[PDB]
Each structure stands twice: as structure tokens, then as C-alpha cells.
Design an enzyme around this catalytic site. Structure first.
Site, mmCIF file in Angstrom:
data_model
loop_
_atom_site.group_PDB
_atom_site.id
_atom_site.type_symbol
_atom_site.label_atom_id
_atom_site.label_comp_id
_atom_site.label_asym_id
_atom_site.label_seq_id
_atom_site.Cartn_x
_atom_site.Cartn_y
_atom_site.Cartn_z
ATOM 1 N N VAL A 168 11.104 -7.678 -0.136
ATOM 2 C CA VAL A 168 11.434 -8.541 -1.306
ATOM 3 C C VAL A 168 13.004 -8.271 -1.615
ATOM 4 O O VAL A 168 13.819 -9.486 -2.126
ATOM 5 C CB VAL A 168 10.675 -8.300 -2.559
ATOM 6 C CG1 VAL A 168 10.833 -9.416 -3.700
ATOM 7 C CG2 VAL A 168 9.138 -7.956 -2.004
ATOM 8 N N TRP A 178 -5.541 -7.722 -3.514
ATOM 9 C CA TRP A 178 -4.864 -8.036 -4.786
ATOM 10 C C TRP A 178 -4.736 -9.578 -4.697
ATOM 11 O O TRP A 178 -4.997 -10.435 -5.568
ATOM 12 C CB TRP A 178 -3.417 -7.456 -5.145
ATOM 13 C CG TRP A 178 -3.562 -6.052 -5.391
ATOM 14 C CD1 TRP A 178 -4.142 -4.833 -4.742
ATOM 15 C CD2 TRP A 178 -3.324 -5.557 -6.862
ATOM 16 N NE1 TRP A 178 -4.042 -3.666 -5.507
ATOM 17 C CE2 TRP A 178 -3.483 -4.037 -6.615
ATOM 18 C CE3 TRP A 178 -2.752 -6.095 -7.930
ATOM 19 C CZ2 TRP A 178 -3.181 -3.251 -7.960
ATOM 20 C CZ3 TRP A 178 -2.383 -5.254 -8.968
ATOM 21 C CH2 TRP A 178 -2.677 -3.729 -8.815
ATOM 22 N N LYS A 222 3.474 -1.510 -10.231
ATOM 23 C CA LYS A 222 2.884 0.188 -10.448
ATOM 24 C C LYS A 222 3.910 1.043 -10.487
ATOM 25 O O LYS A 222 5.103 0.824 -9.379
ATOM 26 C CB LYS A 222 2.232 0.084 -9.157
ATOM 27 C CG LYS A 222 1.133 1.341 -9.340
ATOM 28 C CD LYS A 222 0.289 1.616 -7.798
ATOM 29 C CE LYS A 222 1.218 2.052 -6.822
ATOM 30 N NZ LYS A 222 1.917 3.490 -7.056
ATOM 31 N N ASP A 231 4.473 -8.252 2.383
ATOM 32 C CA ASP A 231 4.430 -7.050 2.935
ATOM 33 C C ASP A 231 4.884 -6.829 4.344
ATOM 34 O O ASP A 231 4.538 -7.761 4.876
ATOM 35 C CB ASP A 231 3.165 -6.369 2.700
ATOM 36 C CG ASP A 231 3.120 -4.827 2.420
ATOM 37 O OD1 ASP A 231 4.198 -4.227 2.859
ATOM 38 O OD2 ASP A 231 2.093 -4.162 2.080
#
Ligand SMILES: [Mg+2]
Ligand SMILES: [Mg+2]
Ligand SMILES: [Mg+2]
Ligand SMILES: [Mg+2]
Ligand SMILES: [Mg+2]
Ligand SMILES: [Mg+2]
Ligand SMILES: [Mg+2]
Ligand SMILES: [Mg+2]
Ligand SMILES: [Mg+2]
Ligand SMILES: [Mg+2]
Ligand SMILES: [Mg+2]
Ligand SMILES: [Mg+2]
Ligand SMILES: [Mg+2]
Ligand SMILES: [Mg+2]
Ligand SMILES: [Mg+2]
Ligand SMILES: [Mg+2]
Ligand SMILES: [Mg+2]
Ligand SMILES: [Mg+2]
Ligand SMILES: [Mg+2]
Ligand SMILES: [Mg+2]
Ligand SMILES: [Mg+2]
Ligand SMILES: [Mg+2]
Ligand SMILES: [Mg+2]
Ligand SMILES: [Mg+2]
Ligand SMILES: [Mg+2]
Ligand SMILES: [Mg+2]
Ligand SMILES: [Mg+2]
Ligand SMILES: [Mg+2]
Ligand SMILES: [Mg+2]
Ligand SMILES: [Mg+2]
Ligand SMILES: [Mg+2]
Ligand SMILES: [Mg+2]
Ligand SMILES: [Mg+2]
Ligand SMILES: [Mg+2]
Ligand SMILES: [Mg+2]
Ligand SMILES: [Mg+2]
Ligand SMILES: [Mg+2]
Ligand SMILES: [Mg+2]
Ligand SMILES: [Mg+2]
Ligand SMILES: [Mg+2]
Ligand SMILES: [Mg+2]
Ligand SMILES: [Mg+2]
Ligand SMILES: [Mg+2]
Ligand SMILES: [Mg+2]
Ligand SMILES: [Mg+2]
Ligand SMILES: [Mg+2]
Ligand SMILES: [Mg+2]
Ligand SMILES: [Mg+2]
Ligand SMILES: [Mg+2]
Ligand SMILES: [Mg+2]
Ligand SMILES: [Mg+2]
Ligand SMILES: [Mg+2]
Ligand SMILES: [Mg+2]
Ligand SMILES: [Mg+2]
EC number: 2.1.1.-
Lengths: 215, 100
Positions: free
Chosen positions: A106, A62, A170, A88
Site C-alpha cells: 500500500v 476479511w 489493527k 497483499d
RNA sequence: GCCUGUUUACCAAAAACAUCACCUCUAGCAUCACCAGUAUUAGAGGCACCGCCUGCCCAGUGAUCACUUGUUCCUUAAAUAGGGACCUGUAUGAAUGGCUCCACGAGGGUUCAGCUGUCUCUUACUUUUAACCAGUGAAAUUGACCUGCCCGUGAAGAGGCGGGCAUAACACAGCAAGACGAGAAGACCCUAUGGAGCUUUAAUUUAUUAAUGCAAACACCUGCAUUAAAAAUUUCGGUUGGGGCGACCUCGGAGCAGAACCCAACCUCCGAGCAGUACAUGCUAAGACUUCACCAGUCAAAGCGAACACUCAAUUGAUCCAAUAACUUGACCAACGGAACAAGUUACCCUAGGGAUAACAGCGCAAUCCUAUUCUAGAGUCCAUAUCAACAAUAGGGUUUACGACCUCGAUGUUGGAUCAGGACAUCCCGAUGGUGCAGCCGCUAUUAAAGGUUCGUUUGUUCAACGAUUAAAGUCCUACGUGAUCUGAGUUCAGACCGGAGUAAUCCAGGUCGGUUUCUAUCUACUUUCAAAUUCCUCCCUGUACGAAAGGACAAGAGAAAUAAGGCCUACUUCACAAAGCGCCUUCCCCCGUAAAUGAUAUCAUCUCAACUUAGUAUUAUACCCACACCCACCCAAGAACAGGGUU
RNA sequence: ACCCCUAUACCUUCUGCAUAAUGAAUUAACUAGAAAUAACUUUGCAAGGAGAGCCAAAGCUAAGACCCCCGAAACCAGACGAGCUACCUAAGAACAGCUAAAAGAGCACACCCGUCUAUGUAGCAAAAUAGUGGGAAGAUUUAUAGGUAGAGGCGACAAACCUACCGAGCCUGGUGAUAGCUGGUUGUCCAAGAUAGAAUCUUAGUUCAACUUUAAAUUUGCCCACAGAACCCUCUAAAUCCCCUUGUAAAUUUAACUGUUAGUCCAAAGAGGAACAGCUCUUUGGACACUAGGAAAAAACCUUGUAGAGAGAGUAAAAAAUUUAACACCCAUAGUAGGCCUAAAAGCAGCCACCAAUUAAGAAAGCGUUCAAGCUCAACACCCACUAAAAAAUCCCAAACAUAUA
């Protein structure tokens, strides 16, 4: 060996998948990169010079698409240089024109502060979310978990996202999806539900794209 | 690199006896693809003398050489032309030291 | 995909077609279509409602107008560069592309909630069928059969062959492991100087139509020629996985037959398609050689006439035909024994065949991989051998291999699942041991062990991959995917359709996606209650013990609870009701052999002994079940398809 | 009768192989080699023959004696077909009920269609049944009559439909189409009889050669001994060619035909980018497609070939071998911790020298310590003896046996 029915079905699907073949040809880390490509073909979410935050970046395909589109690598001299940030908890392989902050989540305010510090102007133009909780074998539980993660992302969004910003996330389909959409409608002018052809037909995965952020 | 039977692969000399070098030399010989053994000047000469002695000593009226050269049973039909020179000691890459 | 609508009658109802609306092209017109119509019309097409964006190769600057420029003429030998005229009655551009959106859909995908035998996990009843009795009475199929099992052989593959084993003979009812089980219809590859449909920038035509010109005739008709449209006839050489990009087909040389000749396909390399010097490179003629045929090709004595039958490895082309007074000349006919001149495509395909078919097609060991052993370098704090292991070697089991030292992607009764599993051990768990870098619990490693067991779910990313929750463990394999005449996904794989790419097209993809017909009544072999021996987990005791500095934490022996499996049963419960069932209840019995030790010789010690020997050691387990036989009227039955069996005091 | 012993159905095809594949339920009947030139054989006549023509340098005349069957998809001509279906024309018919401002609207009958499942699969049916579905006032459904015809029609293009089998209908004819392809090809007995190649729109075929058969003519054929057959490359063998004698009996030529050929396996030598196995290929030879015996069954390995009968005999090849690892007892002072480098290496981190005392010990051969310390070995006595691996999947696979004269 001793493969089960489901194991063999998945494996045949994976081998026959054109996107994995395309990824290995086009030197893409994972097939899901193509999903973003398709989205960018439809809505033109990524432009040169834009600031990109990527969440659940690993393995970084991505980020690869992002850096190519926003000219973060600086391949095109004419195109303005952009910024791509990937977060991540798992280790991400180094990529040119991209920075990776790991390990981080996050949701954590401390990690959020770190992201803001690294980001130029202490803000991000676009947010991309591709993370998913490990499938527990139950559609309902997984759906709830992913909705919860997306809600936490949405809660932390105002601090990081510029007004008029773009947010892609998503989600697995279910009951709570509607509620999430409503919340997106509360914060973003334009809300779209996109199922790319790269996404498996059997899969219940879908993408909420939110444009023109306000408040 | 090709190696035929009877070939000396490596040589060694100096202020030492055979027994001293034999150990590691035999080690190497075993690790070689073909059949090999450590030999001194004395041991090689003894081997050759023993082969010669066996040829002379043999009680068997019938030898491979004799039959092959004379074509005694029409045996050349099942023998190679090379067998005349090899005298039945050599069969393919393999060598039989126990054959007269 | 706007919608209603239409489509492959008999495997595709769709995203395909049509469709309102929009757009492009063509046409200024009567008495048989269009049309008794006329440019707001009609025909040929494209796209698909509407709605919102997307529109200049109209000549440039400077202040409608001047001036070079553009176009045409003339001067100029002709040009360069000069003289004159015009561009000022008007132009719009897309069968272009994107974007949401209302309604709708037996379209494809996802999802909420409920729901249900879909499933956990199946059961009971009714009907059909069934089986028996009576009547009537087919079909596919069939070399003959007096038609067994195991191992082997037959490149796989055996009822029939070899070595073993088995074996009184006959029904009836089940079964589908075998009879490469039966019937067509396939799909794949290849072949035919076999077809056909389609396309074209294949070859050969313009007989037909239309127009034009020239003759004839004084506009039509006729003859000739030219141009187009429309077709018509015919073909699509050979080698190279198969496909794309390439290469090759004839002649000469080398590897290459070690020494008469010939002979190494395919491959690996080289070269040739000339040239130079004569100008008797004239004529003629014994005898010979010969590319394994023929056709071609080669050498040459003598003689006539001259003078005092060239060098080079190949350096090349038949017949016909054409040119020519003759002498001669003519093909990169290179597919080189040469059709005078012909291409693509078929997933709409057809026929005649061949091959796989389907478990072999490559069977006595080179290259490479894995496993075990050997070697003893090197890791392991020192320490080869607790554990791991380099270069190698040996043994066993897999895979690959004859040439484009090119990118591919192959294969395809190929492979999942269900059902039922048979087997191997190279053991994942459960048993017993030896070593440890084994204090104990966990481990690591090896020996022995195949009796029993080896879960349920789900795919966000992952090139034979994971994730969640478990478990004593979630083994590795062989069995023609083990198993489709027991069932079922996907793929090969196609008849319809779209997307991306290719192609002028038809059509293709070695790319993606949607939809999509294989039937079988069992003749034979085999089989249809071997039975009577069950495993495992957890909890408690020991014990919180031994052990250990603590943290932690056993083994034997015993007790209790479960789960599964095998075999039964109905008192309750539950499905139900003279009964059958599970979701309920009851029962379930022997060991395994690797080593650990005494005494003791060869070898007066020692030594567990392929020494005689002694214990753990258990050996052949054993015991259980079954076991008397009227009439074979009839009736009943907890017995049963029929038959048989039990009861009828 | 059976029991014993021996025995892998027949046909046809594939370069070769059958046991592979093809064909056959069985019976009866029916069902497949047609002709010439040229040669050969037998007559007649004979430089002439022939019952005009024609041939003739022994020919001519006559006779005898050699050349299959079934099967495509196709192509063309002339008819016949729109009572099914596609579309159209003429004049007709049908559409309950409920909701709807009222419609190519909705629910929903009849009617039309055929989504999905099950049944059925020589069926009720050469496309059906039951349930569930789509439409059901319309671009609707449907009866009647008419039209468009195959180089064509018709088509809301599905290469759809055009009388159950339409990428081009059906029937008849041409037509006994053609088929280098598949299948078949019918009395008895005997004989001879197998693998160099070349060209080819050619490798599924054909023509020429080679081999094979027959008849005829004539002389050599084969086996072979001295002699003989190249240098270069620096190497290269088994061999080959030629060939008197000899042992043998065949060979060449002439006339006339067909048929066969990518053969398979074994032994040997090689070739395919300098691939020891495998694959493909060349050569030499053998066997096989011809008998039998043997090796377990067995095309190609070994033994053996010329045919019958025998209740005789001698033989040929012809039955795998192998069983494997003990090992010393005793003893050890010391010049010194031999010098250099090293925190120190002191016998054993490294370098140089390697002497020396007892009677007899290496300035130490192997372990072990940070270095030391230690355990061995060689040394003296004592006199002792010391001589190399295995595994797999239905069920191991003849039974067995070391001891009477090859
Ligand atoms: Mg899935
Ligand atoms: Mg539609
Ligand atoms: Mg409608
Ligand atoms: Mg519709
Ligand atoms: Mg229809
Ligand atoms: Mg249909
Ligand atoms: Mg249908
Ligand atoms: Mg359309
Ligand atoms: Mg539909
Ligand atoms: Mg029955
Ligand atoms: Mg009856
Ligand atoms: Mg019948
Ligand atoms: Mg068998
Ligand atoms: Mg047998
Ligand atoms: Mg039966
Ligand atoms: Mg049989
Ligand atoms: Mg043809
Ligand atoms: Mg033809
Ligand atoms: Mg010749
Ligand atoms: Mg040749
Ligand atoms: Mg002369
Ligand atoms: Mg040619
Ligand atoms: Mg040629
Ligand atoms: Mg030639
Ligand atoms: Mg198609
Ligand atoms: Mg075959
Ligand atoms: Mg076949
Ligand atoms: Mg080390
Ligand atoms: Mg294969
Ligand atoms: Mg089993
Ligand atoms: Mg074992
Ligand atoms: Mg398998
Ligand atoms: Mg089966
Ligand atoms: Mg469907
Ligand atoms: Mg009774
Ligand atoms: Mg048959
Ligand atoms: Mg009509
Ligand atoms: Mg009609
Ligand atoms: Mg009308
Ligand atoms: Mg009504
Ligand atoms: Mg309606
Ligand atoms: Mg309706
Ligand atoms: Mg229609
Ligand atoms: Mg179409
Ligand atoms: Mg089509
Ligand atoms: Mg018909
Ligand atoms: Mg014929
Ligand atoms: Mg004969
Ligand atoms: Mg030709
Ligand atoms: Mg051909
Ligand atoms: Mg042919
Ligand atoms: Mg001679
Ligand atoms: Mg061959
Ligand atoms: Mg000693």
C-alpha cells in the site's frame, strides 16, 4: 514433536478456540473475520453499495465478510452492488464478487495508483487494515513497526479515502498508540478503540476505528 | 474373488516353450497373495507323479491318513472332521506339498 | 456493573443481589399488622442513576358531514335482501429496545515509565527449625515378615513365583524411585421396582380457603353441588456409546444346526393384528402331541344326532371386574404373563453397592497406515537400481472392526511446564567409510558409530501450526503425563454468576466467559564424593594451495583464542571480610572396525580370506589416587549433624 | 540352631480364576438358625384314636426332628431450641487526627470486614497467624432485654442463616423401620454332590423346570445290530434318532427338602450387512471350580484319578531343530545400408518376407549411436568343466558339551 511450553500453550488455545471451530463450520478462511463481524454488529461500518479497500487481505476472510455485507457478490438483488479490493504481497485464493491485486504494498505510490485505477470513481469508501509485521519476540519492536505501518497507511489515506469515510486498523498496544490516536483525531471526527471478544484476551491487539473523515 | 489351493489362476498357450513364459509368470506368481508357481502341462504332471511316488515310496509305517481314519490315539479329539479328507496335507488356507 | 452498600459463617466478594429514578399490576378503606395510614397513599412486582432517540388495529374514501360498512332486532317457511336503532359526553400507545456519558470499583483484560533476587544464576549473614545433651511425652498406621537386584511369568502389574546374580551383622543422619505408600473427601459411569429437593401441560384429590348456586333458617351458620387458588400423596418400565432425532418390546417365515428334536444372543431382511365359505363352525369320548416349567396350545378312533369336527404361516390377550333373565360380550391391557389409575429435573444433592480405579481388559493377524526388503512398469536428456518410484508381495511396528450402511464428539491421575533424568537407535550434530547425475565449497544416498552434545524468546493469521534471533546441531522415541508422599498451568469439573441456544417450567448444553481448599511427622526396599581418561566452535598457517575457464574454493599437519562440562581454589576483582561465594582464577590425558589393499588355493588365470594368511588394527587400554595406627582426660581445628578425623613439642 | 532340599499367608467377594480386591496390631471377654402344614422315625391303642370340640375307606394319639446377626439415606407424631446466626422491637453506646462548601465525600486511628500471598494443616485455632488489603458520620459498628420455630421462621436469593454436620434443625418415640445391597455367620469325623431352559417393572432377585440329596416301591436302565427316519433348493460333512444281542448294574416310580446356573479356557463346527485375524454368540466334547506328576514359573495343555503307613519296585507324560549364492575360454567375413514408412533408420522407431556364400554366423537375441560407427550372444575350430534378510527402550541370560556301545 519436541514442543516447547509456549508452543503447547498456543496449540491448546488454538484447539480450544470456538472461533476456529465456527470458521471451519461457516467456511471462513481465518478466525479474524469474526472480529470484523463484531465491529459491523456494533457500528454498522459496512453497508450495501460501499467501496471497500482491504489491506493485508490474505487469506481473504476479511474480503469474504466485506463482499457478504456490501453485496459485492450481488446475492441480494434489492441491495446495491458494492466493490471490494484486496491488496497483499502474498498470493490470495480467488473469491467470487471480489478482486485481488497481488503482489503489492500500500505504501508504494505505483501500487496506490494501480489500486485507484481498479477502484470505481478512483476512490474508496472504507479502508480495512489487518496486516501485522512478523512477531520478533519483543513487544516494543513489534509495536513500533505496526504503528509505523499504520502511519504510512494514514499518510496514503487522503488520496484513496472519500470525505466522511471509515478507516479500521489493527494495532498492538504501547506508547506510540496514543500519538496515532491523536493523529486520527486530527483527521477524523470520531475515533474509537475496540477490543472484540474474538480477539484473544492474552493478546495486546486492538482496533482503531475512525469515522467521518475530513481533509 | 476366492482362490483355493490347486486352482489355475491364469492360463497361457501358443507357439512358445515353458522357459520363455516362465520368467514373467513366476514374477506374477510371487506378487500374488497366496503361494503360487508357473506350471506347464509336463511340470504339473511331474509334480503329481512325484507326490504319488513319495506316497508309495514312504518308509514311515505311520501316515496321517491311517491314524486319522482309525482314530488310533483318540486323535480325532484334536483333529477336524475335514482332516479325514485333507489327509493332513491342508492346514487352514495353507497347503503343504511336502506331506504324504 | 451508574455509584455507597449486600452475598455463599468454613474453598466463589463478583459481571450476582440491592440501589436512587423509571415502569406494571392491585386496592375507595378505620380500632392487633398495612395504620392510629387513605390514590402525591399502601401493597405486590419488573428494570436499574441521569441524559438522548424509539409510540397508534381511535372505520374508510369523497366533499364536521352523507353512506355502507360493523353491531343488534323484525319481515321472510327460513332466507337471500329489505325495513328500524346505534357506532359523536373518548382516544394516546412500551412491567418495549438501542445509544453515548461523569464519578466509582480488593471486578476481568491490555498498556507507559520506574522498580526490584521473579529471572539470567545464585550467594552471604541472622532468627526459627534442625542435630546432640537433660526432662516430659502424642497421632495417623500395623495379616505375619528372617522385608535384595536383573530378566521372565502372572491379559497390566512381583521383596516373596522361575532362571540367573548378590549377600557377616547391627546404628545414626539425609532422600523420596517403589511398597497400585497412609488418612479422609472426592470427580466419572452404572445399578437399586433405595431416597430427597425443585418444576409441571404426570396421576390421584379438594380434606383447607374463597366465591357461586340449591336446600335449611328466618345477612350469618349448617348440608349438598360447582368453580378457582393453594397445596397434599405418589411415580417416573425395558433394549439401543453416552446425547439429540429415531427404532424396538407379542406372533409367523428365511439365512439357521447341512441328516430325530432342541439350539445363533446381538444383528439383516420379511410379513401378522385379517379375511372368505358354512350355519350339525352339533353333542360326546379311547388314545396321544406339546414351543423345553406352569398357564396356555394341538390332533383324534369309537358312539349319539345329522348329511348322502372348513381355506389360510401367524391373523392374538389370563385373573379380577362390568353388562346380561340365560346364552354370551367387553382392553392397539401392543411394555402383548397384562400394577385399576402416576411425568420431567437435580452442576444443592443423599444412601447402599458395583465398575473402572491406575500400566492390561481386544493376548499367536482380516482391513488400513508407516518403515525396510522383493518385484522392474515408469520418472530421471539416453539410462530401473546417483536419486525417486505405480500395482502389488514379504517382514516388523501401530490403529480399527459385528451393524440406525443417521450429523455428532468422544477419551479424561488426560495432558503441559519445573527438577532430575534412566534407556533405545530407527543418528539431528560431532567420528570413520562406499556410491553419486561427487571438478572444489556445499549437497543427495547408504554402511558403521549412542562417548559427548542437542539454544533463548514471542504468538497478527495457521486443526498437533507458526514467527524472530541463533546454532555444530536445535534428533525420533520408550520409561504408569518417566517423575504431583519433589512443585506447579490448564482439562475432566462441578457448589456462585452471566452470554448464545434448548426447554411451559425446574433446569440443560455434547457451546463461550469470570471466580473457586487435598493433607502427610518416612516403618520397609533402594540410594546418598564409580572418577582418573572432555567435547565442540571459531580464527590463523598451509593458501589463497590443490581443483576449476572463471565465479568460487578444500583435505591432512600445526598454532592461537574461546564456550560448555567435569574437578578444584581465593592472589586480585565482585558479593563480602579471621571465612563463605561467583560474576573471578586454575587444570582436564586412549582407541573404536565400516571398509581399503598384498600373496594365494578350492576353481593350477583371477580372487582382501565365514580358505590357510599379510598390513592399515590397538591389543587386556594403562597409569594416576588411596595405603603406617597412641590416649580415645581434655582443649583446639581449615574435620564435623552425632559419631568419626587432624593438631596439642 | 543355621547352612541342604521342598513349600506363591488366612478370610470373604466377583458368572470362573487367584496371585486381584475386602477384612484383621495383638490378647481376654462378649458377639449371630427362632416355627408350621405336609412327610419321616419311634411308641400306645386300633375300625377306631383322642382326658368333650377334631380326625378317620388304617387311622388316630404322643414324642423326636427344618427356618440367623450387624448396617442406611428416609417417613411420621410429640416435645426442645433465635444466649450462634437471619430479620425485627424497646431503650442505649461508640467513632482520634487531616482535607474539605461540606456529602450513604477523600486520606487516615480505634472499630468492622476478609482481597491477595505466605505460614499453619491431629494447627494457637473443627477456619487461626503475619503482611497486604475494603470500609471507617453511616443502607455504619456494637452491648442489653424481647419476638418470629420446622408442613415453619428469616432472607439487599447465596438455596444464605435458623447452637461447629440445613435441598429442609435437634431430641424422643413409632423402631429390633426397611434394605432383591455390603459385611459377618462359632466343635470333630465321614459320605453323596456342578452349568438344558421358561416367565418376570426382568437379567445384583424370585417362581417353575433341569441337575443335585435322602428314604421308599418296583422292574428294567445303559451299551446297542439288521431293518427304519423327504422332497424342494441342486446339492451337504462329522454325525444323530431308533435299536435285539451282548457287556454290564442300574433305572423308573413314590414321599420329602433345600441349594446351583450371563461359568472360564482348550479342540472342533458354525452365526453376527457374503469382515480367513480379533470381539460377541450357539452347538458338540474335554479340563478347571477335586489329587498328583510334567511343559520354566503356569485354573482350563499332556500324564493320572478313591484317599493310610513303608528309608521297596515297575512305569506314564516328560530335554526343538536349523547355517545358505564363484564360473566359461575362444572367436566373428560377407550377398546388402533385405525391401516399404521415414531428413535417415543402415540388425536393434514401426510393417512384411525371413532366403543366402564360404567349412562355419539369426535379414540379428542383448546393449550402444539423431542415423552411422562400435561392444557382446548364438555360429566354426580348440577340448575345457560347470555346477539367500533384520531392528527398542533398567542388564546377555542356566552352566556347558560335536567322539565308549538305548
Ligand atoms: Mg498470547
Ligand atoms: Mg456496583
Ligand atoms: Mg462507601
Ligand atoms: Mg463497594
Ligand atoms: Mg458475609
Ligand atoms: Mg466462603
Ligand atoms: Mg473469599
Ligand atoms: Mg442486577
Ligand atoms: Mg471489587
Ligand atoms: Mg528430624
Ligand atoms: Mg530427648
Ligand atoms: Mg494409637
Ligand atoms: Mg517384574
Ligand atoms: Mg524369584
Ligand atoms: Mg534411615
Ligand atoms: Mg507385598
Ligand atoms: Mg422407590
Ligand atoms: Mg418409600
Ligand atoms: Mg411340555
Ligand atoms: Mg426360546
Ligand atoms: Mg367320528
Ligand atoms: Mg412387561
Ligand atoms: Mg412380557
Ligand atoms: Mg410366550
Ligand atoms: Mg451452577
Ligand atoms: Mg474392580
Ligand atoms: Mg473398585
Ligand atoms: Mg523412461
Ligand atoms: Mg482405551
Ligand atoms: Mg540422559
Ligand atoms: Mg545404526
Ligand atoms: Mg509418554
Ligand atoms: Mg510420586
Ligand atoms: Mg479473587
Ligand atoms: Mg585424634
Ligand atoms: Mg486393615
Ligand atoms: Mg430472643
Ligand atoms: Mg437474639
Ligand atoms: Mg427501635
Ligand atoms: Mg472523625
Ligand atoms: Mg465515606
Ligand atoms: Mg475511605
Ligand atoms: Mg442482611
Ligand atoms: Mg441465584
Ligand atoms: Mg444455585
Ligand atoms: Mg447445627
Ligand atoms: Mg435389616
Ligand atoms: Mg466324596
Ligand atoms: Mg409386568
Ligand atoms: Mg430390576
Ligand atoms: Mg435385584
Ligand atoms: Mg435296547
Ligand atoms: Mg463369555
Ligand atoms: Mg560365442
Amino acid at each position: 514433536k519436541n514442543r516447547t511450553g509456549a508452543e503447547h500453550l498456543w496449540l491448546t488455545r488454538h484447539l480450544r478456540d470456538p472461533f476456529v471451530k465456527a470458521a471451519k463450520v461457516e467456511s471462513y478462511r481465518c478466525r479474524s473475520a469474526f472480529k470484523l463481524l463484531e465491529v459491523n454488529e456494533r457500528h454498522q461500518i459496512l453497508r450495501p453499495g460501499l467501496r471497500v479497500l482491504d489491506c493485508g487481505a490474505a487469506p481473504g476472510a476479511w474480503s469474504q465478510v466485506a463482499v457478504q455485507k456490501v453485496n459485492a457478490a450481488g446475492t441480494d438483488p434489492s441491495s446495491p452492488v458494492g466493490f471490494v479490493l484486496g491488496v497483499d504481497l502474498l498470493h490470495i485464493f480467488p473469491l467470487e464478487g471480489a478482486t485481488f491485486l497481488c503482489p503489492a504494498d500500500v505504501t508504494d505510490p505505483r501500487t496506490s495508483q494501480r489500486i485507484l485505477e481498479v477502484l470505481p470513481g478512483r476512490r474508496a469508501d472504507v479502508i480495512l487494515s489487518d496486516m501485522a509485521p512478523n512477531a520478533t519476540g519483543f513487544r516494543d519492536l513489534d509495536h513500533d513497526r505496526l504503528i509505523s505501518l499504520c502511519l504510512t497507511l494514514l499518510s496514503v489515506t487522503p488520496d484513496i479515502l472519500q470525505p466522511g469515510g471509515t478507516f479500521l486498523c489493527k494495532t498492538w498496544a504501547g506508547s506510540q498508540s496514543r500519538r496515532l490516536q491523536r493523529r486520527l483525531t486530527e483527521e477524523f471526527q470520531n475515533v474509537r478503540i475496540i477490543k472484540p471478544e474474538a480477539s484473544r484476551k492474552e493478546s495486546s491487539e486492538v482496533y482503531f476505528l475512525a469515522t467521518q473523515y475530513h481533509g | 474373488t476366492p482362490v483355493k489351493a490347486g486352482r489355475l489362476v491364469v492360463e497361457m498357450g501358443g507357439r512358445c516353450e515353458f522357459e520363455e513364459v516362465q520368467g514373467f509368470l513366476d514374477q506374477v506368481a510371487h506378487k500374488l497373495p497366496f503361494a503360487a508357481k508357473a506350471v506347464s502341462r509336463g511340470t504339473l504332471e511331474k509334480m503329481r507323479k512325484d507326490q504319488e511316488e513319495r506316497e508309495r515310496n514312504n518308509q514311515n509305517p505311520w501316515t496321517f491318513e491311517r491314524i486319522a481314519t482309525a482314530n488310533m490315539l483318540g486323535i480325532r479329539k484334536v483333529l477336524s472332521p475335514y482332516d479325514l479328507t485333507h489327509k493332513g496335507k491342508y492346514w487352514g488356507k495353507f497347503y503343504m506339498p511336502k506331506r504324504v
